[PDB]
Symmetry: D2
Subunit: 504 residues, 4 copies
Amino acid sequence: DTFLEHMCRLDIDSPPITARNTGIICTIGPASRSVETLKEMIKSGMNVARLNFSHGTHEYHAETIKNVRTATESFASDPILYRPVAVALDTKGPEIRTGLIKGEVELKKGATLKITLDNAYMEKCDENILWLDYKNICKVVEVGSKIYVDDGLISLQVKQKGADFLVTEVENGGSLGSKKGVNLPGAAVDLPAVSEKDIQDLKFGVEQDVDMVFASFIRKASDVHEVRKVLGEKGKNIKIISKIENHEGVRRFDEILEASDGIMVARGDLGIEIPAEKVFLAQKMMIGRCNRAGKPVICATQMLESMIKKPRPTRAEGSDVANAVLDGADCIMLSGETAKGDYPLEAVRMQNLIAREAEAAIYHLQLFEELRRLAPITSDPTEATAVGAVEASFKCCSGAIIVLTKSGRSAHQVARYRPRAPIIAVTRNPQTARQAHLYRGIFPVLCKDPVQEAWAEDVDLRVNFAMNVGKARGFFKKGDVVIVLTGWRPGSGFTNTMRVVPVP
Amino acid sequence: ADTFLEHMCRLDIDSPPITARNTGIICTIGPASRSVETLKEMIKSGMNVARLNFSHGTHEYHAETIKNVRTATESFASDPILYRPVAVALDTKGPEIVDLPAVSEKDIQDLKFGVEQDVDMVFASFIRKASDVHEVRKVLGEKGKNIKIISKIENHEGVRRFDEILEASDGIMVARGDLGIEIPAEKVFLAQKMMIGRCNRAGKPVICATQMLESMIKKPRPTRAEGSDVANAVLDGADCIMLSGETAKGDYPLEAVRMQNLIAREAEAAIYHLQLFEELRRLAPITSDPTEATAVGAVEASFKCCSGAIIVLTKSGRSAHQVARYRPRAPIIAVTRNPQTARQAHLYRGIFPVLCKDPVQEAWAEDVDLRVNFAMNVGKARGFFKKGDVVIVLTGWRPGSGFTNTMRVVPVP
Amino acid sequence: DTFLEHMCRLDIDSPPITARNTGIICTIGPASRSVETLKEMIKSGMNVARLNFSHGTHEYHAETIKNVRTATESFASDPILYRPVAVALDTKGPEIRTGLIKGSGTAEVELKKGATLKITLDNAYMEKCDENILWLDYKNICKVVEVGSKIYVDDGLISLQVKQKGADFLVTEVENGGSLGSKKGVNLPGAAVDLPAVSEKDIQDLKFGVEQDVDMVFASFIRKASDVHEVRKVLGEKGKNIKIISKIENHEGVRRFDEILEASDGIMVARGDLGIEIPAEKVFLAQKMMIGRCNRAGKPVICATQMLESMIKKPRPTRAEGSDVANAVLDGADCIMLSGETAKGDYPLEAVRMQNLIAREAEAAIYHLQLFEELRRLAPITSDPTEATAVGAVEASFKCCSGAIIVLTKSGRSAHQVARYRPRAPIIAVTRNPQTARQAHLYRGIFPVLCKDPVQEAWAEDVDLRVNFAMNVGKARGFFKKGDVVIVLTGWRPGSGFTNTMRVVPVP
Amino acid sequence: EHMCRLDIDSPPITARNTGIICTIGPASRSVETLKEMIKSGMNVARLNFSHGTHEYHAETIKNVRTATESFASDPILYRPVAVALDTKGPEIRTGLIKGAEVELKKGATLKITLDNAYMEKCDENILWLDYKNICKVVEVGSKIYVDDGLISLQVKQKGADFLVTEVENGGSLGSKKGVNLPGAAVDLPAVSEKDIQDLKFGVEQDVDMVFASFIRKASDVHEVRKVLGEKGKNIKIISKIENHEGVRRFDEILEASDGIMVARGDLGIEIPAEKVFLAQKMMIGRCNRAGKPVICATQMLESMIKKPRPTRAEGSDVANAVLDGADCIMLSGETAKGDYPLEAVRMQNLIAREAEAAIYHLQLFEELRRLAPDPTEATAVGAVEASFKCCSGAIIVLTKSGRSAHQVARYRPRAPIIAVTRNPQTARQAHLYRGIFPVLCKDPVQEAWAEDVDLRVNFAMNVGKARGFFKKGDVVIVLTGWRPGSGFTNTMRVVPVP
Ligand SMILES: N[C@@H](Cc1ccccc1)C(=O)O
Ligand SMILES: N[C@@H](Cc1ccccc1)C(=O)O
Ligand SMILES: N[C@@H](Cc1ccccc1)C(=O)O
Ligand SMILES: N[C@@H](Cc1ccccc1)C(=O)O
């Protein structure tokens, strides 16, 4: 009845029998590359596998994808318990990176550091000289500008502008390693959004059959469509997730969202570009707008960073990941925790626990009450059935909303209204089953059975397939009642048929 | 905005904060912030309550600090319009290494010292049950009966028996770091949200402590994860935010106070006051106490006739406290001649307490107008409202009233 | 959003664009028995034909019923524009009547105000009544009345108060004076009269209704729940599908309304003779209470008597009658019954036309959204698919501003449960059962249509044909057009257990 | 819905919140009868200036005030009684029957004449009326209605000074009966010479309200306001809507008028009889939205002129007027010339008290809140809002001009509004507004302001406990100013009943 009293009833000693509705995306790297480890990671709750193309070769990532798909299809023998695992391609984009250390160096406060463009010191960086790959650096920043190196752990101040160099004073010190990312906040970064390397990697994704692309450093709508053109006709089905990681992306969010399939909120990279006391507002703004438009939103960076070396996360991390879920994030991404961490499996397992516990603190009723009031007054048959199905899901105490779909668009439209009941998406399309994980609350199942001659025989077969899996995952028992969404005729165009069927 | 989602959607990071910072700021005063000149700058920056950790330091050491807090505070007493009341808190040591005594021999000595030093509130450490709260109440006695007891939840048993503690206490402190080692980390946020929620329902203050801005001890800027951690705590419905080592021994104490003001004022824009009040009105037991009736009616009017503030003429503070439990968007200007209640009012979120130093007029009605006019001048100076605006004034009916039942819709002169 | 706003922007110069959703029942007597008149009455609005079995023999009514069906089936050649006409049998019921005054049945004796009068059960006085002595055919008068009770003679014009009780005699005091004729109705306010639910004639009349294949029975003078089941048992297994509408005619019927409603299919509020029993300042509350309780239950309620009585002699009704009928519609009544206006009056056609005008004007004053909003919260929590799909269809009817709700029903039940929640859009009940199409008129909002097409062997095609049939009628009646969107409720597979399927379909 | 919870056996547990206006004629003129009428529930006494001399009405007013001030000994039980003046206006009236009523039969021929020799010789064949310009404004086929529309005539032949009509709807024709000409450009002045003399007499008699007959446009109300002028600036003008143009140009009339009377009987003749119920609901609704009193008149308990008990159709009609949101309901011939005048007022009190049980006050308030676009208004909303929240027994309002209490009644609370006033005229005028229980304070003004309020609140608290509005332990809401000689009624205090 009230959100306030809903928070008052939260018991920590009471185990949560609420399904972990958010999708877990894991960055696959050197520590989780093997087939055997991936098998366990899928069981723990991995839904999407991210491949970071900032490092490694095409051949390296090709073997990674093979290991991901081998571990996934090891459960294909049992379609009742099978889980679709999506493949993701994270682009490098316009990055500025440091060189190599001669022979990690320790930087002291107030010390003079010379950032050069001379390729003689490319692989000879020390406590005095530094090299980076952005040739137009002295043309974009003036005297007094702040240069951030390695997650913004090392901060510099330009004392004097040079020709092919920059004289900087160290404000924040630390262990400066090789090949580290460089940030220039408030600079006219004139690097292309889609570099020549990005064009190579994006086309490789088309050939490796990726389900989604995480496009880095997206600043405007024209950037998104440049990624759309590179994917072309053969990659028209691949979902483009635009990563917001600077101030311009926050400023021009409306045009980015309207051009993109989804948005990734990189809170670490954003925290360096914009002031720290404003990042929480940007996260809550961007997630809320993605909820309004009904497009997937992923939270990345600074999630469980402590789990790279320790088998347990801290308090602040557990609270921060949970608050992202409460904001309305569809997915939450693990970076170095699963990529190169000492405890990759535990990083996935803890994420399942943190997200599942956050589910109890979500007041679903209000979300649907509010989303239907902003839902445009339309006569769209699918949209009217989507509202009606979620409306009926709350009133019938429904175990699930079974949605029969080919494209996924009808199942995605149900997810927009955020129901308590999990949305079982029945499909024969393997890609749309993988891509369904981007959305919160959608439980995708892949029907392997052939298309039945009669239309009614096919629907009842797919409904009974979803009924079996829903009972297997404990969503609903025998005496429960669920909602089924289908079309009316073969080649319908609209998923407008809603029926309230009791579970056999 | 008609919608909480719409309220989140319209948020703009480039837009300067329009709403004043309703959250309370509590600072641990130690070696770094002990000096009068530093304390003066913290009061200007936004410090409301001064904390003294009795885990270390002698009674001589703390009495010198309390004197310095009051030396810094009373320098602003020259301007009654701009003067800010600063509360003095006493954080008791608490038994450390369970049926260990609720109040140790040192704690009893420290508590009685607080009564002598005229402290405003006690942060009772390691509270596990209701008998622990009553034992602290016993030590304070009749001389410290107006001192507020804020129970510190630090263990698993503190969470399990929270309801008997809250009813007995005057307020609650969520020690998040201390709770983090006692219970699993993936559960602390739920415990934090439950406690803050139940405190909001009860009408009793709630404070968030430990692991707020720990990085500001050595660095002049916080990590963005801390900025989120502080903001969400405020967004849960917390009244006050407590800084520990950032102000006590850290290298950047003044910067920590200013950063606390910036985060909490930014988190203020993400708060939906329409939902908070409507839910608190529904869940509240329907009257029939004339004050609770007038408190609800005033908060509803603050939205309906779009008021700039709620002026409350209170003596003990309880009236402004019962208006604060319903969470209005407009600030609650609590006018009082009592210094202690002006100091203790910072515990409640949304209250701007002002100390009236004017003499009591022989005619009651004239004294009310004088107290109201003072609140108008303060409100205009703080930029809460202007001449054209309308405010809601709350008073008692006659000299020596048991109720604050009188309500006035009054245009600003 | 405001109900007051609706009243503020009402215009009398503006004709009603809102459709008349409340069913019209007409009594067929001497003035309207002719097929030609019955043809014109169906055109004007008539939905249900009422036969008053209080007068006229079985032979007389059988011709009228035949005449009603002759006039109805003349429009059968066009399935799109055909309107089913229901047959209603109004029973005579139990009635207390006096004897004859001093011989002849035309003789009339004056009665003093404040004088003593005696009532006897001795049958020797049955044709020997005067100023002092009166006779009643009710043999059990003494055991239902007590000292100080009221006895009303002839439509409540003569009131009496009993002073002393006996074994089979009553001495009474006269309060209301006037002339007293022979064999006239007697009323007992607040008294639990134990006359049998069905009279010996009613047993004959109810069996006759089954033989004439009636749709509904207006069971007269219902006082308790067992009275309804008495009529039910008489109609038997053969007349199980005949709807029983209980008539509330006295104080006991109002007091024991809940048990009557839970035992009946519908309710009739006969305000006229109910006004004789209970005081005038309480009749309107009884009317508003009973109609409200019927809406919550989801069972039809009809208002009767004192409707357009002036139209028996005049071509136009009075203001008070126009407002009285409109208020009854606004209370939430499903049907509105005409008595002497259509039966024995001078202007039976002008009466049916006027009823269409008032009931259509009242529809504008009704705020449809609120009716559903208050009925949604009061609906007890149930996981029954048939009721759960019904709430979703009415939810969408306001959401996507639908032209109509198309319901494929066989027994009527599916359409009834949708009508319970009162949507603005009409409920087109597509049925193959002729009786279902006729009985549906009892519910407000239901526009029944009779599909005469053969059952298509492919189930999906049989639905599409019935849906396209409703789509054809909907355009013809002007409920919706090409651009509009409608809601369709169906089963799932041939011989479905529930009507669980709902569709949002555009109009071709 | 609380409609299902209604019970006819249980006595009404709520006060009769609507006002009762009774017409005073020969059958209720006496002081003895008037006393019992005030006891039975009469609030406003209407004087119909269509009949009787100025000498006749002055004695009637005297008798009303003599009967009212007999209860003045007990200020707790005292009820203020208002005096109303109903103007004649543009009326058309028949002549006098020679030799008594004549029988008019359907199909017969009746001649309408303007001959002054025939003005007192009216019969079955010939009939005289006072409208001298009837020939110029009426046409062949036009309908002429006589005696409140009971008798109808259709014009068959026109003449220079005569009209030949056919009797369409027959009946019994009395003397000096009212004549209607629907759809005719009646060039009779809105304010006649008699109307000027009657209004000036009203000011002389110190009347509280004027019932303005046959108002078609806004300038008709302004013309009445001019005749009252400076001396009668505080007399409330209630415009009667009796014709079609009054409905068409309603928004301009309401703006110029203090209140509205819905003459349903006259309206049912001038417009189609079926569309009247919509007009009644529209005019009441617009009056409730504007915060001005609306009265329902004519065809209330008409059968009570002859019978001691009304029909159920009359009871259901009178109740529905209240249920539409009417402030007052007026009796005409039932109390003026009827055989049972006292019983008519008692039925009125019963019906309106029973109809009160079927009103959902929370619905009305939540709807009137949103349509509202000032400290006095803001405090008026808050008082009604709180009255539901703390189940208040009453809303006590200290008022001088009455406006403060009128602002409260506008939002239609469930709790009775007790208006404490020292102004006698505002105490009498307060009956126009629904849910306002006016009470006249005759106590001297206390030197200390807070003392004057606490004494007045105690006076209202004694009245409320006597009327059964509340008791010890209940909660009331008090509305006052802040100081003596103040602007706004912005003070709201919640006070428990001792
Ligand atoms: N789609 C995710 C999360 C999820 C689980 C269960 C129900 C709904 C969503 C998965 O299948 O793992
Ligand atoms: N109570 C705190 C915060 C606050 C400011 C302004 C209004 C309300 C609350 C203070 O006065 O400093
Ligand atoms: N069922 C009635 C009334 C009605 C009309 C239109 C829509 C709904 C109901 C008829 O067919 O005439
Ligand atoms: N105004 C009328 C009716 C009324 C009675 C009681 C309460 C409110 C109104 C009177 O005082 O007599």
